[PDB]
């Protein structure tokens, strides 16, 4: 399990890569094998992208660390976030082609500049 | 099966078992099997039990037996009237008072030891519990 | 139906019950674990 100290440190790591990151993408992680997920983790370390699946009420505490607070309603449902620490984009262009490749899950809401991007307009990134 | 090598006298008075135990504490191992109830332990009982907890530890750690069957019990056989002396010596026993420590143990995981002691106590006539050695 | 005075859980799927003032052990998995006290 996870002690309160565990959760505290992890909130500090998500808040710490969130401050350092240029852009983020929140998505549904449900209904996909660990094979295709390690495939998007290779396509992740190759694109500079930091991949995570983190607790929701943990990510309200980490995203209270600004300016991703427009995403706190995007945390209802299973949360997989892609932070591109190197470049903006390359998460939002990789996820739409991974979700069209799999035809599972969603890829719900993005965040850039301090604002949230609705699901059909993430083609901006 | 334990029994005194040689004795001063061959037979004994039935005696009583009264009052409480000496050696209430675990002086060797980390754990011990203490007796809550009061009763006589034949050598057979002690041996069978020691066996049980020897299977249980797969011959690891170490086992002490703190009790000894030093007092001889007699029985006249069947179909024999009263008198004509005292009966012949059948077997040996150890008098047990509440709070004696029958076996000690160490060099083993606690969980496993509670187990082995349950299996050991299945073979014993008297009420028993598990105990840990303490500082002071 | 093992009928005895010491009744136990023989696996993880065995579930203890008191029916009509009897203690029984019921299993979904293993019909051989079906017990009653007596």
């Amino acid at each position: 399990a996870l002690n309160l100290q565990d959760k505290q440190a992890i909130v500090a790591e998500v808040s710490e890569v969130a401050k350092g990151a240029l852009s983020a993408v929140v998505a549904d992680s449900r209904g996909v094998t660990v094979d295709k997920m390690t495939e998007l983790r290779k396509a992740g370390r190759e694109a500079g992208v930091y991949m995570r699946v983190v607790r929701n009420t943990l990510l309200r505490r980490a995203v209270e660390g600004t300016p991703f607070e427009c995403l706190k309603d995007a945390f209802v449902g299973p949360t997989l976030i892609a932070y591109v620490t190197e470049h903006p984009g390359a998460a939002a262009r990789l996820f739409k082609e991974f979700a069209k490749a799999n035809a599972k899950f969603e890829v719900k809401a993005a965040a850039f500049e301090g604002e949230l991007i609705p699901a059909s307009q993430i083609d901006r990134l | 099966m334990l029994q005194p090598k040689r004795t001063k006298f061959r037979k004994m008075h039935k005696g009583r078992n009264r009052g409480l135990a000496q050696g209430t504490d675990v002086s060797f191992g980390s754990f011990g099997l203490k007796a809550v109830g009061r009763g006589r332990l034949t050598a057979r009982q002690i041996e069978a039990a020691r066996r049980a907890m020897t299977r249980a530890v797969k011959r690891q750690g170490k086992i002490w037996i703190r009790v000894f069957p030093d007092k001889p019990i007699t029985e006249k056989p069947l179909a024999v009237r009263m008198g004509k002396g005292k009966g012949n010596v059948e077997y040996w026993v150890a008098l047990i008072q509440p709070g004696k420590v029958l076996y000690e143990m160490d060099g083993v995981p606690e969980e496993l030891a509670r187990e082995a002691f349950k299996l050991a106590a299945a073979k014993l006539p008297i009420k028993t519990t598990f105990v840990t050695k303490t500082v002071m | 139906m093992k009928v005895r005075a010491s009744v136990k859980k023989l696996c993880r799927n065995c579930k203890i019950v008191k029916r009509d003032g009897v203690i029984r052990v019921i299993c979904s998995a293993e019909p051989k674990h079906k017990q009653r006290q007596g």
Binding site: - | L20, T24, K34, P98, G99, T129, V135, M136 | -
Partner: protein
């Protein structure tokens, strides 16, 4: 740090002690040093859960008696034979 609350014993002997033990309280003593001995009673539970740690035996504790602390160590302790209980504690002035 361990702080034990206590009262001064107004009685003595086997009878007093066994009424003490019936009430879920138990007798102990404080001696050593220039002073006279001080016999006191304690709550069985508090102390039973307190000596459930090891340091209790290696350390300087305090005893609150009629507003007044004393600083002591655990000297020897006699336990009931089969029961998870304490018959008595020798406290030596620290």
């Amino acid at each position: 740090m361990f702080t034990i609350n206590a009262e001064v014993r107004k009685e003595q002997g086997k009878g007093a002690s066994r009424r003490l033990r019936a009430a879920n309280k138990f007798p102990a003593i404080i001696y050593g040093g220039k002073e006279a001995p001080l016999a006191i009673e304690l709550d069985h539970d508090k102390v039973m859960n307190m000596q459930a740690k090891a340091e209790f035996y290696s350390e300087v504790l305090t005893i609150v008696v009629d507003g007044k602390e004393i600083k002591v160590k655990a000297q020897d302790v006699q336990r009931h034979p089969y029961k998870p209980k304490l018959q008595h504690i020798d406290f030596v002035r620290a």
